[model samples]
Target: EKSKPNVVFVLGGPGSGKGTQCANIVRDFGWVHLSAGDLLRQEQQSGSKDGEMIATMIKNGEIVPSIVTVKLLKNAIDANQGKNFLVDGFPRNEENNNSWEENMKDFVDTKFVLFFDCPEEVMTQRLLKRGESSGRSDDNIESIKKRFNTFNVQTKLVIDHYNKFDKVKIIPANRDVNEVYNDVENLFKSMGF
Candidate 1:
């Protein structure tokens, strides 16, 4: 039986290594890794009735409608009962968070916030560097700036929501990747993982 916590959340802005570190955590500890972006893309690729509209909304940098997002997450939660999971890139605003709570109620045991705190200069530098290899349509300078702006305007509020729950652990991620992983591993250990 999986005695470890069945759910944990990792939250941070783009280029803060949320995806990378989540991969590390899953590999080291065997938690299910569920990136909201990945899930959305999968649904988009499946060509569900809502897929085209959702794809367009994401490409235009707008939040996916709460109803669709909630359903996708709920499906994951149900499918992974008794297994651990790390939910990424959803709940970017109070509305998203509220909808989650309204639907899931106490189903979520939101343990700690693994926040990757980095300055804009460092993040911008890393984002542009990744863009060189990412080849993602959304990774260009103009699009990246828009993504950063969207995060600042919308996603930052999600951080405050976690703060209200006293569940934030700020990891100063302006250093090497290994160093950052070490800090994160320590936090999970301290949490009785």
Candidate 2:
């Protein structure tokens, strides 16, 4: 059993501006942002010998095995013990949700899931533009469509699951950054941050 810590799951499609919003939330709310993608990329780049495997999976827009992903998340939480966290881009499916909750049950009190709902058109435009310099292999149109399909099929269910418990806060994210952040700021404020 591990120590329980406050966590918020940040969920969205590939280009729904989760990273940008999470950054703002961290700055203004004193929450640590722990993006699953970033963590995975670190694992792939840390010379730990899992780099090639992870690279292949990511390039194909496939979800990494939950065990590997959760281990990395648990380590991050352990390393930043006692800090509240914004866990972004994880629990992409029911299996992932089950594994994470089961394994981390003793160490997590998830406050809520933040769902950034964005239209495919907007996300596609943002991703294609980002691909120009983002250097992410999965940023191309084909990979992005695959990611979107995955999100719709796998990730959105996570939201639906949380919604049943009134634990989801949906943010319409196709607007300007500051406008969106204003809503985000209001959300935390309402939560007594």
Candidate 3:
């Protein structure tokens, strides 16, 4: 019999290598990486009731409503429950966390929120590079700037909120990918998953 899943929320600005490190961590540690950004992006075109709204919010780098985001995450855990998970780019603000407290309090065992921070100039350059390569609609300069602004204004509060509980791993992630992975892997090893 398995226990409640151990969940780690991986938060970072765009192009901070959160995605790459997650892939590395998952391969080595077998922790499933559930990306909230991509999960929400996937819904952006489902043509369902919330698709247009989610799409509009995302295109402008706004956080989607928590009611929709919270359940999508919980559903993933219930489907993939064999091991721990890395929740990437999630719980972007207080609204998302309250949804957790309101609904997910009795579900998964939250270990910590990993906040990988990078300077605006650092992440901005990488985002610009990725935009040309990936061609995603939200990768343009307008959205990129808005995202950094939103992170400083909103996401930082969530980090501080979790900090009181000593549940945040504030990682400095403005270096080589391997170096960043070392810091992350070290944490995962110590956390025993």
Candidate 4:
């Protein structure tokens, strides 16, 4: 069995600054960053067998199947060897959480969960601003609304699930990026990381 390494699951809404904060974490902490959305997007563009299906699901603001996403995550973990990592945009629902625990039980563990909490209006405006340049089909208003609904109904449940383990750290994400990250950094420090 491959040795499991440290991992922090980063959760947040579509425009809750996961991308920005993850980048800072990588720079400050030397952890590899893996974004589930970016991985799925790349797979769709690569014309893989599941490309069309993943594309359709993303456009509809639906979570990709656990089998597909978990496989991609496994490959990424394997490729990284023994390094620490920050996994963003994943475990979006109960199924995704269960699948990760089941399929990757021997290969990984969630040291803690970092939740970027932000207001809906703030996130909506940020996503709209991002849509102007992101070139992502899911960035539009309709899709963003659908994604927001999905997050509230499904993703938030995942947070509750992790919270049961006392492995959740909630970070207010409505502030400036650097300011929010300082809080995150302090959390990491307090954890002795």
TM-score of each: 0.91, 0.94, 0.95, 0.95
Instruction: After superposing candidate 3 on the true structure, give the runs of residues whose Cα lies further than 4 Å from its correct spot.
Output: none
In order of TM-score, best first, we have: 3, 4, 2, 1
Model 4, position 57: C-alpha lDDT score? 92
Give candidate 1 misplaced runs (Cα > 4 Å): 1-5
Cα lDDT of all candidates, in order?
A: 0.78, 0.89, 0.86, 0.89
lDDT of 1 by residue, 1-193 (tens): 4443356667766677888888989888777888887788899999799898888877776788778887898898888777777888777767887897788766656666677888777877788888789746666667667677778998888887788878778889899999999988888888777
- Candidate 3 has an lDDT of 0.86
Please give the range of 10 consecutive residues that has the lowest summed lDDT in model 2.
Answer: 1-10
Better of 1 and 3 by TM-score: 3
lDDT of 2 at 147: 88
Off by over 4 Å in 2: 1-3
* TM-score of candidate 2 versus the correct structure, residues matched by position: 0.94
By summed lDDT, the worst window of 10 consecutive residues in model 3 runs over: 39-48
* Superposed Cα RMSD, model 2: 2.0
**Model 4 CA deviation exceeding 4 Å by range:** 1-3
